[PDB]
Design a protein around this ligand. Structure first.
Ligand SMILES: *C(=O)[C@@H]1[C@H](NS(=O)(=O)O)CCN1C(=O)NCCCCNC
Ligand SMILES: [Cl-]
Length: 361
């Protein structure tokens, strides 16, 4: 009954959403009562007929930011930076710029004062161009006042964390962060030998899409991983105490909230909600206006532990893929939904909510 019921529940949540959104391939991984469960649907590639499995690599887009936050948590952990450091403390090129007056915390939580969703098209993946972009940028409003969701914001936070550790961001992730977390199917740059696992992405008229190079791509949206590895990361988040202390502390640093916007409390990478909450509210928290419009923040008097009866989550996309991760610390419950189409966030949340609701029931 239990195995049959869980399959029944996940199939029921997933299958209509896949059909309705014309999703070629979708992987689910659920952590429940200390055990992983995988459900794989459809095709990693429509053209070669490769099936989705729990080891298929998907682009997770902005979910990468939770890994970036973990690296930053490590640098914090290790007293190499503080959240109240000025950005320009960690990059001489920024001294004399507006980043003299913006904190690492502002950058991590999108309150630096109007850094946009993405780098402009004119900024290529080039150290000098990135440097020059930040040097010339001016806040639209006072740092610390408004949240505007931004790749250049948290991207810079990740880059500066790497600088504080004295190594390239990409090298730190490959050589330190991924091994510490036990992740052998998680990549910024997929090895040639593992490319057979890399799903095709699909956009309009099913054109094939895989993510290309962009400025601060590793920090903002660089990770390709499997449902099995992403669930391993969720399990590390559910039980940081199971990791060696330096990494336990790094993960804990991503479970601290600094302010609220509506129903959402903003942490490093993770965004949190009270749990239970209605599906419509959780969808609103992950809606297009949240990503695209500035919102005045409600600052907390002290950082808040994002634990107990809460749902922590992150959406992420690339042109060809759509990812969603959600976990409930107080229930030892986590889930990962990875697809090779960029389909609406509301639909991702709908699948997850149906699974979580069914598990409670
Ligand atoms: C991350 O996935 C961000 C946005 N995150 S979300 O929470 O709003 O879903 C969605 C699109 N994002 C992203 O990184 N896109 C990748 C394309 C990079 C293009 N920059 C030139
Ligand atoms: Cl960007």
């Amino acid at each position: 009954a239990p195995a049959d019921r869980l399959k029944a529940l996940v199939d029921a949540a997933v299958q209509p959403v896949m059909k309705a959104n014309d999703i070629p391939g979708l992987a689910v991984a659920i952590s429940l009562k200390g055990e992983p469960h995988y459900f794989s649907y459809g095709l990693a590639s429509k053209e070669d007929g490769r099936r989705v499995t729990p080891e298929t690599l998907f682009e997770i887009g902005s979910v990468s930011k939770t890994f970036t936050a973990t690296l930053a948590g490590y640098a914090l952990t290790q007293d190499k930076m503080r959240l109240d450091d000025r950005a320009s403390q960690h990059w001489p090129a920024l001294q004399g710029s507006r980043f003299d007056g913006i904190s690492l915390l502002d950058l991590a939580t999108y309150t630096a004062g109007g850094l946009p969703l993405q780098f402009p098209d004119s900024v290529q993946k080039d150290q000098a161009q990135i440097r020059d972009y930040y040097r010339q940028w001016q806040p639209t409003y006072a740092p610390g006042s408004q949240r505007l969701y931004s790749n250049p914001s948290i991207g810079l936070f990740g880059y500066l964390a790497a600088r504080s550790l004295g190594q390239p961001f990409e090298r730190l992730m490959e050589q330190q962060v991924f091994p510490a977390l036990g992740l052998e199917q998680t990549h910024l740059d997929v090895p040639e030998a593992a490319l057979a696992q890399y799903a095709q992405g699909y956009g309009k008229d099913d054109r094939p899409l895989r993510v290309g190079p962009g400025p601060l791509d590793a920090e903002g949206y660089g990770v390709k991983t499997s449902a099995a590895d992403l669930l391993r990361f969720v399990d590390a988040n559910l039980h940081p105490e199971r990791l060696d202390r330096p990494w336990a502390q790094a993960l804990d640093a991503t479970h601290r909230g600094y302010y609220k916007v509506g129903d959402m409390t903003q942490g490093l990478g993770w965004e949190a909600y009270d749990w239970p909450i209605s599906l419509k509210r959780l969808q609103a928290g992950n809606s297009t206006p949240m990503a695209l419009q500035p919102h005045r923040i409600a600052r907390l008097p002290a950082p808040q532990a994002l634990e107990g009866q809460r749902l922590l989550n992150k959406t992420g996309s690339t042109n060809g893929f759509g990812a969603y991760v959600a976990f409930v610390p107080g229930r030892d419950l986590g889930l990962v939904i990875l697809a090779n189409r960029n389909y609406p966030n509301a639909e991702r949340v709908k699948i997850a909510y149906a699974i979580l609701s069914g598990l409670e029931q």
